[PDB]
Enzyme design. Sequence first.
Site, PDB file in Angstrom:
ATOM      1  N   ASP A  43       0.851  -1.175   0.000  1.00  0.00           N
ATOM      2  CA  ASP A  43       0.000   0.000   0.000  1.00  0.00           C
ATOM      3  C   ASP A  43       0.901   1.244   0.000  1.00  0.00           C
ATOM      4  OD1 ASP A  43      -2.585   1.303   0.447  1.00  0.00           O
ATOM      5  OD2 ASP A  43      -1.668   1.886   2.359  1.00  0.00           O
ATOM      6  N   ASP A  45      -0.395   5.006   0.920  1.00  0.00           N
ATOM      7  CA  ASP A  45      -0.739   6.019   1.900  1.00  0.00           C
ATOM      8  C   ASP A  45      -0.830   5.463   3.322  1.00  0.00           C
ATOM      9  OD1 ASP A  45      -0.755   8.128  -0.079  1.00  0.00           O
ATOM     10  OD2 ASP A  45      -2.619   7.255  -0.826  1.00  0.00           O
ATOM     11  N   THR A 111      -2.344   0.997  -4.747  1.00  0.00           N
ATOM     12  CA  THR A 111      -2.946   2.095  -4.018  1.00  0.00           C
ATOM     13  C   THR A 111      -4.417   2.302  -4.398  1.00  0.00           C
ATOM     14  OG1 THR A 111      -2.685   4.452  -3.437  1.00  0.00           O
ATOM     15  CG2 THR A 111      -2.117   3.853  -5.701  1.00  0.00           C
TER      16      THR A 111
HETATM   17  N1  ADN Z   1     -10.624  11.414   5.605  1.00  0.00           N
HETATM   18  C1  ADN Z   1      -9.555  11.086   4.839  1.00  0.00           C
HETATM   19  N2  ADN Z   1      -8.394  11.780   4.954  1.00  0.00           N
HETATM   20  C2  ADN Z   1      -7.295  11.506   4.221  1.00  0.00           C
HETATM   21  N3  ADN Z   1      -7.245  10.515   3.311  1.00  0.00           N
HETATM   22  C3  ADN Z   1      -8.425   9.711   3.103  1.00  0.00           C
HETATM   23  C4  ADN Z   1      -9.642   9.963   3.863  1.00  0.00           C
HETATM   24  N4  ADN Z   1     -10.529   9.049   3.434  1.00  0.00           N
HETATM   25  C5  ADN Z   1      -9.883   8.303   2.477  1.00  0.00           C
HETATM   26  N5  ADN Z   1      -8.597   8.691   2.268  1.00  0.00           N
HETATM   27  C6  ADN Z   1      -7.609   8.120   1.307  1.00  0.00           C
HETATM   28  O1  ADN Z   1      -7.926   8.602  -0.005  1.00  0.00           O
HETATM   29  C7  ADN Z   1      -8.186   7.546  -0.933  1.00  0.00           C
HETATM   30  C8  ADN Z   1      -9.584   7.681  -1.531  1.00  0.00           C
HETATM   31  O2  ADN Z   1     -10.572   7.548  -0.516  1.00  0.00           O
HETATM   32  C9  ADN Z   1      -8.038   6.239  -0.183  1.00  0.00           C
HETATM   33  O3  ADN Z   1      -7.068   5.421  -0.824  1.00  0.00           O
HETATM   34  C10 ADN Z   1      -7.667   6.601   1.251  1.00  0.00           C
HETATM   35  O4  ADN Z   1      -6.428   6.015   1.638  1.00  0.00           O
HETATM   36 MG    MG Z   2      -3.074   3.155   3.073  1.00  0.00          MG
END
Ligand code: ADN
Ligand code: MG
Lengths: 211, 211, 211, 211
Positions: A43, A45, A111
């Site tokens: 992954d 993020d 991702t």
């Molecule tokens: N509240 C949030 N804040 C930051 N990143 C998010 C949030 N919700 C989802 N994401 C990220 O953004 C992408 C799209 O939802 C996902 O891969 C997730 O990891």
């Molecule tokens: Mg992640």
Amino acid sequence: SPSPLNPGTNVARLAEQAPIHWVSVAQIENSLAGRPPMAVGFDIDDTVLFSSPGFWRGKKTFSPESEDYLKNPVFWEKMNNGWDEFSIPKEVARQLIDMHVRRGDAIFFVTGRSPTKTETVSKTLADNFHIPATNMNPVIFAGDKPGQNTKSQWLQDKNIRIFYGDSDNDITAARDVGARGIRILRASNSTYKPLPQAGAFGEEVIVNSEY
Amino acid sequence: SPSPLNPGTNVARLAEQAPIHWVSVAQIENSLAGRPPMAVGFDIDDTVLFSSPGFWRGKKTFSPESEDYLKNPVFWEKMNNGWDEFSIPKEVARQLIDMHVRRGDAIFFVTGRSPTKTETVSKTLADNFHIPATNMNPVIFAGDKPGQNTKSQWLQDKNIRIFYGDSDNDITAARDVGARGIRILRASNSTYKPLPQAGAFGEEVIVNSEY
Amino acid sequence: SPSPLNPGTNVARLAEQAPIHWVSVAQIENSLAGRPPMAVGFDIDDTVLFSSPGFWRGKKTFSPESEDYLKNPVFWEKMNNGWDEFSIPKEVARQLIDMHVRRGDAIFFVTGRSPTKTETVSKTLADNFHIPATNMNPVIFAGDKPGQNTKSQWLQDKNIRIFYGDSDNDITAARDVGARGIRILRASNSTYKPLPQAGAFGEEVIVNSEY
Amino acid sequence: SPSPLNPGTNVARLAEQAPIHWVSVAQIENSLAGRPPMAVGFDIDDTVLFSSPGFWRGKKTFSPESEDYLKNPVFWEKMNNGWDEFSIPKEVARQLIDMHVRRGDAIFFVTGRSPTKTETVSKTLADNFHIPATNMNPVIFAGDKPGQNTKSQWLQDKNIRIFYGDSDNDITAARDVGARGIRILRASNSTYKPLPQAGAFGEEVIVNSEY
Ligand SMILES: Nc1ncnc2c1ncn2[C@@H]1O[C@H](CO)[C@@H](O)[C@H]1O
Ligand SMILES: [Mg+2]
Ligand SMILES: Nc1ncnc2c1ncn2[C@@H]1O[C@H](CO)[C@@H](O)[C@H]1O
Ligand SMILES: Nc1ncnc2c1ncn2[C@@H]1O[C@H](CO)[C@@H](O)[C@H]1O
Ligand SMILES: Nc1ncnc2c1ncn2[C@@H]1O[C@H](CO)[C@@H](O)[C@H]1O
Ligand SMILES: [Mg+2]
Ligand SMILES: [Mg+2]
Ligand SMILES: [Mg+2]
């Protein structure tokens, strides 16, 4: 809140441990000793990049009052073509990627970010993690669709045997295909809240993996 | 119970601290530097002695089905005249008593145990903690009476300036008389349950004081 | 020392606490009950903003192999005029600032960041923390010149009574002028390493203040 | 190394986890679902009984300046024929024994205590843990002779499939015969010091098993 001004504690609580299968990078490496090169996946993020800076900027820029930025193609273009200059690589990922390079493994990134016309995320990752050309594979932008785990089919397609991730869907994508799903802790200053319950599927969780 | 099979955790929970004023023996000693000899006091049970063995034996012997042993004069005779041979001195108490002897302080023990015709607890304490004759004072058996803190008047009478203890009533006895009440953690294998909330009055709590 | 593959642990270690004066925002508020409006101060980086994203980008852009970026006015112009759009406000700071605004206190920010020709940091802070213009004061850019205390003179000038910060120098700057120095935890994914030893001067440290 | 008066801490340290395979009793039970009745074994001291009270009394009585009491048959006669009236049963053991009795498993106790002419330990264990006579087996007093493994032969003889214990030798004894060795935490107020490194062989360790 509200909660007691002086709540106190006791030594049962101080010593209390959740029943979690904690592992180290060294233990993972040892568990793979003698196994030939294979495909592994990460992954992005909160697994290899603390990318909250871009997501935070994105929400403020594109949907300060809602969550619409996450389905906004303009947001994804910014996120995938420069905002990772502000993303902070995770030490746990440096150590895992180094280990998988030692092993001669093929390294994939899968991702939930939406695909865009161009992307410089692959470059950012290869550069920051010093990934040789042979081990590196272009980032797979699987997207996000409520009701579906978009990652599972990619793990199957690329024969990925181990998948590292912070979210429940990372672990269950691995489970979906019979791969070994290993959890990384999401940092408590991530803007992606609430934090997941690492270990909730009985999976291995890497110690100290919030940074 | 019942509770989830794989509850998991997160790094906010892993790093979470209760707002407690933790102190060490060295910090207490430092806070008293240059102060002349004074009277100080210690609770006994779960403060200087892990005496659960005698209380456990006592319940089984005198009231296996109730709590009546605690008001049984025969129990107290056994407890105060030999069963402390099975009581395990606490390391935190060794360190505190050594420190107060260094200071030239007068050392008192004020216990909720009931008074008996004879007692060998004073001997047990002086011997095990190597307390010189000049610093040692005969144990004060204050007893236990629901609705009353039997210790407070003894702290006043003996001019006790610091009182160490594991129970809420030890800390509030100190507060009652304007003394400095300092909390020791009750061991999680004590039979005196539930464990108190150490720090619930905003008092100092000694680190690692369960053993 | 050997770092074993399977180091194990024990319950003394699991329960072990550092002797730190932990406090909560609620306890700080309680300690100020009835006290009239006063001036209070905050450090910025890792105190109210997780600004590592910009510092990380700055290092990569201006001095990938050295620390020279921290003395480069071209970096500071970027850092102080827009890169904080990628900084993540800390929840502990939201709570403290709300509490002090509610009290009617004057809010100052005293940072070791280098001064620039213009700065938008004051606006970023007032907007993100919802600081009324009355309570708000323009950021004081004290600079950072190792071997020199550059914050103490400002704390004295503004009669700042409480100073919140993550660095050792934040606490000692406060102490040097007789102000109450209160420590905030630097996040473990900060790029400013090593992490300080919060509580190293016996100061109060706010619980759970890494996020 | 200097041990500072105010050592402080940081959030990396606060969140730091040793890489240990933690399990709960419920997880162990789940892992055995559908498996037919089998023989299981328990160590005694610091596994099912906090027996330090008797060992402490024994040291003081029989060898205050040495470890000779541990080889003194006069001590063992006392320890095995009544001093366990002062031993405190462990909650983790109540839960494990209940679970195994419910399964219909045969319960064995294999201890390094020296054998004596008579013993009442078997009765103490059956009574305190409510072990039916069918599941119960007389305690096996394997003895303790450093440089020798005295438990493995007994684990093999009784076809013991799971062995619970606090000591390193408990785990390796199980491993040497192909049994599942599961670690219980030794309480920090045990007089058997130093505490073992639970998890030092990569074995499962039961959470919260110090009491
Ligand atoms: N509240 C949030 N804040 C930051 N990143 C998010 C949030 N919700 C989802 N994401 C990220 O953004 C992408 C799209 O939802 C996902 O891969 C997730 O990891
Ligand atoms: Mg992640
Ligand atoms: N349930 C219990 N188990 C062991 N000791 C107890 C219990 N309740 C009270 N005590 C101790 O016995 C004394 C009389 O209640 C008190 O001083 C207290 O410390
Ligand atoms: N590596 C770094 N990351 C983030 N902030 C830093 C770093 N080095 C210094 N700083 C902060 O920037 C200012 C100038 O160096 C100092 O006050 C310090 O707090
Ligand atoms: N100091 C001690 N306290 C409690 N139990 C001990 C101590 N030393 C040894 N034992 C236990 O008694 C047995 C014989 O020494 C061993 O199996 C060991 O587990
Ligand atoms: Mg007590
Ligand atoms: Mg700072
Ligand atoms: Mg044992």
